[PDB]
mmCIF file of C-alpha atoms and ligand atoms in Angstrom:
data_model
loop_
_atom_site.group_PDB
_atom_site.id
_atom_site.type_symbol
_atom_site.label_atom_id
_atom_site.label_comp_id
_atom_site.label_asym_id
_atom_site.label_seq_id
_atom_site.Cartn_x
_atom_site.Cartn_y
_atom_site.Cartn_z
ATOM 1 C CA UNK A 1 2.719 -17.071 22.267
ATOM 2 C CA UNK A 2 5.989 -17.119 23.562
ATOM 3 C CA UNK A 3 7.101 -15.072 26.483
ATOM 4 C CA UNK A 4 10.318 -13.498 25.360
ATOM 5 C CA UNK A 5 12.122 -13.928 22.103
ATOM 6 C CA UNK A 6 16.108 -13.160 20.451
ATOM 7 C CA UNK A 7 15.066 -10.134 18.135
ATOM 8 C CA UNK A 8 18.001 -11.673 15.884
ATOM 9 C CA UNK A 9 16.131 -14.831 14.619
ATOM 10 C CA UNK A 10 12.659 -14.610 12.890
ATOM 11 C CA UNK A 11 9.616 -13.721 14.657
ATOM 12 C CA UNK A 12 6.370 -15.087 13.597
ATOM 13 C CA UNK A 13 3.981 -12.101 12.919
ATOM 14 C CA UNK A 14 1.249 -14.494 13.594
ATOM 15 C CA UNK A 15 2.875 -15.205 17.675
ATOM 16 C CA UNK A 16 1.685 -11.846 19.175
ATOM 17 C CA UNK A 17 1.115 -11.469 22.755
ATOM 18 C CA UNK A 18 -1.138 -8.809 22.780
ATOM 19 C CA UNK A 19 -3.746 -6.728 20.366
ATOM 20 C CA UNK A 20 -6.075 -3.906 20.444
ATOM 21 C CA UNK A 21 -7.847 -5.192 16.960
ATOM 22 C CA UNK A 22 -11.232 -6.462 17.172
ATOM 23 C CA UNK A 23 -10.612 -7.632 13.050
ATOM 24 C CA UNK A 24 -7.105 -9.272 13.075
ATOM 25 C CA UNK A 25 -7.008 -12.927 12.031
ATOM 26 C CA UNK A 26 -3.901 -15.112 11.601
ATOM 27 C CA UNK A 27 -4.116 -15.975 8.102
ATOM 28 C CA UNK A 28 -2.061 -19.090 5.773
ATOM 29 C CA UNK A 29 0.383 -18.106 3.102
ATOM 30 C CA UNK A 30 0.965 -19.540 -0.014
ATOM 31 C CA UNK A 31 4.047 -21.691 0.871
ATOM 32 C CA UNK A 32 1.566 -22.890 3.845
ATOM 33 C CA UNK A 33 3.243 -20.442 6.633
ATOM 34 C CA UNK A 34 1.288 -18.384 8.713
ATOM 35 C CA UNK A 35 1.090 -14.480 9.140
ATOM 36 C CA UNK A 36 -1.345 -11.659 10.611
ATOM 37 C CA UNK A 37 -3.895 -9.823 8.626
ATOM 38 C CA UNK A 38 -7.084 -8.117 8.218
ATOM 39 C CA UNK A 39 -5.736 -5.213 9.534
ATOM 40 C CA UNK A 40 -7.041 -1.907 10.065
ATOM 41 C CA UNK A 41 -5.709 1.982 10.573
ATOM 42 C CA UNK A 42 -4.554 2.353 14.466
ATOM 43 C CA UNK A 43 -4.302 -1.321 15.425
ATOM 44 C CA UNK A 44 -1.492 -2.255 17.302
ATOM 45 C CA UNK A 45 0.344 -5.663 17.899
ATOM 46 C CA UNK A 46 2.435 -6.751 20.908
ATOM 47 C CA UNK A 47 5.204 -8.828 21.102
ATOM 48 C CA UNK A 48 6.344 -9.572 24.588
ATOM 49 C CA UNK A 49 10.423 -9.429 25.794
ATOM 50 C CA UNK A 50 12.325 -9.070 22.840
ATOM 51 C CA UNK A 51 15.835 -9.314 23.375
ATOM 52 C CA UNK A 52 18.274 -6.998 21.638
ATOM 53 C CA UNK A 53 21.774 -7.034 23.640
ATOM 54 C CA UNK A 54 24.180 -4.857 22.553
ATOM 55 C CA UNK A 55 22.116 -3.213 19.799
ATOM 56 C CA UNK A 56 20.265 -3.334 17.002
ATOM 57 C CA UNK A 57 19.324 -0.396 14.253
ATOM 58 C CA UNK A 58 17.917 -2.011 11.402
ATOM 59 C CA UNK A 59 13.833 -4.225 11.398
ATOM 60 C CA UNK A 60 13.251 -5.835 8.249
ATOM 61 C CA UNK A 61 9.389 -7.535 7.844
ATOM 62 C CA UNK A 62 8.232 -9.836 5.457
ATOM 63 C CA UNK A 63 4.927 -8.331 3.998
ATOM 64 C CA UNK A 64 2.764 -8.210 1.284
ATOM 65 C CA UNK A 65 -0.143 -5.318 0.216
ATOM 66 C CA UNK A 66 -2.401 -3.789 -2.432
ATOM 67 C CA UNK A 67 -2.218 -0.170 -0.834
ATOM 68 C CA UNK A 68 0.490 1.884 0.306
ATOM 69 C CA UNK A 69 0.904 2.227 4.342
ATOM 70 C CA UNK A 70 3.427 2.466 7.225
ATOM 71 C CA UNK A 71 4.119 0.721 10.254
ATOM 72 C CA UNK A 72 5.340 2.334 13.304
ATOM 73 C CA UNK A 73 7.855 0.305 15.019
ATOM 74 C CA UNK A 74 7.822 1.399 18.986
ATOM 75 C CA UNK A 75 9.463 -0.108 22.138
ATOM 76 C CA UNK A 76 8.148 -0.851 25.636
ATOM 77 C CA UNK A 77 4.106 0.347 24.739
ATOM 78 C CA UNK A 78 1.794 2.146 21.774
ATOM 79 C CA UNK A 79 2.856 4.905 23.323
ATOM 80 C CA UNK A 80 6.567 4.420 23.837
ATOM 81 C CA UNK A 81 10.047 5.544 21.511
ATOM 82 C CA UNK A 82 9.231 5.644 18.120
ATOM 83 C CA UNK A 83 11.945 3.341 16.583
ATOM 84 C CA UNK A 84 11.412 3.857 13.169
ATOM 85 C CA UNK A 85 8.961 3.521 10.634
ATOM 86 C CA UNK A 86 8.424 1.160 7.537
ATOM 87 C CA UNK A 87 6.889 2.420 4.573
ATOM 88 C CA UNK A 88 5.216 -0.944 2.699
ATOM 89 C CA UNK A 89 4.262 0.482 -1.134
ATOM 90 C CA UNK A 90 1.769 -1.953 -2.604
ATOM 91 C CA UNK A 91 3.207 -5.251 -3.596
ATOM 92 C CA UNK A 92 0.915 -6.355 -6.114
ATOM 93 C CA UNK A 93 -1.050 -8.850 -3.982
ATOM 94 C CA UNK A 94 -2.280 -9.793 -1.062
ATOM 95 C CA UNK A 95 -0.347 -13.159 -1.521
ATOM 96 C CA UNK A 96 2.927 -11.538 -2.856
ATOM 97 C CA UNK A 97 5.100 -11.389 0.503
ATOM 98 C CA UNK A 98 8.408 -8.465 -0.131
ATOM 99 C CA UNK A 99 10.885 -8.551 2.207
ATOM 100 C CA UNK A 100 11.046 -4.991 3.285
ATOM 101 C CA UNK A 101 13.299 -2.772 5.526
ATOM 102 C CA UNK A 102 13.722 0.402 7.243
ATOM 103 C CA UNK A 103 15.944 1.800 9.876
ATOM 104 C CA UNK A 104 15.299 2.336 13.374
ATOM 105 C CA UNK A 105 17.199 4.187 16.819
ATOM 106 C CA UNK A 106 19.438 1.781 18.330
ATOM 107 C CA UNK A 107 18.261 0.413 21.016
ATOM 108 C CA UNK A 108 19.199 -2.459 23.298
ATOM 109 C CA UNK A 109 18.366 -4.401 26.223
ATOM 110 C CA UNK A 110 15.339 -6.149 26.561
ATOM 111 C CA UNK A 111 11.657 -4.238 25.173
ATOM 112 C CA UNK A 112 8.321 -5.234 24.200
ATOM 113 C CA UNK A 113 7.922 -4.004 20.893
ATOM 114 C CA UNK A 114 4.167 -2.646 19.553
ATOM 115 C CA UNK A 115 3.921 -2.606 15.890
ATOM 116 C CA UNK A 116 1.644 0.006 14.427
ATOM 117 C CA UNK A 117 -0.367 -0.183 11.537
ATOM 118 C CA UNK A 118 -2.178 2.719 9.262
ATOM 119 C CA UNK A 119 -4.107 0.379 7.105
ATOM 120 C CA UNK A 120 -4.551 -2.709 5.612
ATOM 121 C CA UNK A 121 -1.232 -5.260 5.182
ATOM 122 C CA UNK A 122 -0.190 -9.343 5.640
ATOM 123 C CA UNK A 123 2.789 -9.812 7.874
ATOM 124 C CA UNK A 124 4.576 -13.163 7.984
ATOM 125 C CA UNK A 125 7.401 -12.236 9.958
ATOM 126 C CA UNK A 126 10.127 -10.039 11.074
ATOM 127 C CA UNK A 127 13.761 -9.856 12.248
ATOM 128 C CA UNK A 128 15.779 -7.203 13.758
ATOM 129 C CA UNK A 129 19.437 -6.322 12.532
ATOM 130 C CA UNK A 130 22.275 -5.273 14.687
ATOM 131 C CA UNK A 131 24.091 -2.470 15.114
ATOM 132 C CA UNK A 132 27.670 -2.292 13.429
HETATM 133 O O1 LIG B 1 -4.024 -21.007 2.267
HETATM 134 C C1 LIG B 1 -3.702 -19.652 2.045
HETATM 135 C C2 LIG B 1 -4.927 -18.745 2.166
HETATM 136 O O2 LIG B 1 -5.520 -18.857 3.456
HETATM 137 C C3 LIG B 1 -4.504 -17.324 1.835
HETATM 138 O O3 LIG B 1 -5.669 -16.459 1.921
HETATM 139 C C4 LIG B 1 -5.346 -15.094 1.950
HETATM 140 C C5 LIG B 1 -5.451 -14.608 3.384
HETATM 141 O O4 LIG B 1 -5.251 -13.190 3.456
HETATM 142 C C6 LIG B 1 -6.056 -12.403 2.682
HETATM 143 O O5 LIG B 1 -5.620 -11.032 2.763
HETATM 144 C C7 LIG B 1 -6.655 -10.132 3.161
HETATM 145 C C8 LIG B 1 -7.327 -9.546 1.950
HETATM 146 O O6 LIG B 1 -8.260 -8.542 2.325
HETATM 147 C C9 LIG B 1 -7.683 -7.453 2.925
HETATM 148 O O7 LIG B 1 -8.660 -6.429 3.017
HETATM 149 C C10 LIG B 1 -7.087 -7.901 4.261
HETATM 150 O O8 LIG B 1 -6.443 -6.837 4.930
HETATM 151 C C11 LIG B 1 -6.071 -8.996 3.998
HETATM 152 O O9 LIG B 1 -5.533 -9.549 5.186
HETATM 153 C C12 LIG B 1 -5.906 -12.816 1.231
HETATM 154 O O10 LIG B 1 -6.698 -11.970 0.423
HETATM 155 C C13 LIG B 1 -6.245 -14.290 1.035
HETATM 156 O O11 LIG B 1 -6.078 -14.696 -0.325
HETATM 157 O O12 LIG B 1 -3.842 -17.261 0.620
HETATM 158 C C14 LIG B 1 -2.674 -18.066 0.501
HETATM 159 C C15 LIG B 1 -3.180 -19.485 0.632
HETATM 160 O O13 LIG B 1 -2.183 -20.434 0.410
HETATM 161 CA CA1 CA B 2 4.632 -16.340 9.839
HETATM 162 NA NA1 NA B 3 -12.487 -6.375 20.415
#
C-alpha cells in the first residue's frame, strides 16, 4: 500500500498499511471498486503519512451498513488525538455505499491516521476536507 498519501484526493479504504483485525477482507463493490469489510467492534486500520498542509477539519467516507455504528477518526496511533467521530446509521444494505461526513479538529502536517471501528461496516474510500 502506498507509503504516504495527499489527504485531499481519495483514499482507497481497501490500501491500508496496517491492521489489528484477524477478520478484515478487502471486498468488490457493485460498480466493481474495491473497499474493506468484515469488520468487527475495536478493529483498527492504518493508513501510513497522510499529508494535510495547512489544515484540514472536515473527513467524509464512502460507506455502506445494515446497523448503526461510529468510527473514530485518530492521528499518529489507536491511541493518539481523537479527530472526530462519524456516526454511519444503517444504509439499507451492505451494497448501498452513502457518502457520509463528520467534522474533525484541525489538524495539519503530516499523520498516520487509525480509523476505528465499533461494529460491522463496508468502506470504499475516504477524503479529507480543508480548513476554510
Ligand atoms: O462483486 C461484488 C461482491 O463481491 C460484493 O459482495 C459483498 C461483499 O461485502 C459483504 O458485506 C459483508 C456482509 O456481512 C457483514 O457481516 C460484513 O461486515 C460485511 O462486510 C456483502 O454482504 C457482499 O454482498 O457485492 C457487490 C458485488 O458487485
Ligand atoms: Ca475503494
Ligand atoms: Na490475526
Amino acid at each position: 500500500s502506498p507509503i504516504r498519501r495527499d489527504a485531499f484526493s481519495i483514499i482507497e479504504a481497501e490500501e491500508y498499511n496496517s491492521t489489528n483485525s484477524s477478520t478484515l477482507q478487502v471486498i468488490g463493490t457493485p460498480n466493481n471498486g474495491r473497499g474493506i469489510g468484515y469488520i468487527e467492534n475495536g478493529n483498527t486500520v492504518t493508513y501510513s503519512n497522510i499529508d494535510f498542509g495547512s489544515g484540514a477539519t472536515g473527513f467524509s467516507a464512502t460507506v455502506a451498513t445494515e446497523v448503526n455504528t461510529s468510527i473514530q477518526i485518530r492521528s499518529d496511533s489507536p491511541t493518539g488525538t481523537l479527530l472526530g467521530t462519524l456516526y454511519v446509521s444503517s444504509t439499507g444494505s451492505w451494497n448501498t455505499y452513502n457518502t457520509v461526513s463528520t467534522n474533525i479538529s484541525k489538524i495539519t502536517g503530516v499523520h498516520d491516521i487509525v480509523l476505528v471501528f465499533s461494529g460491522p461496516v463496508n468502506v470504499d474510500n475516504f477524503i479529507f476536507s480543508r480548513s476554510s
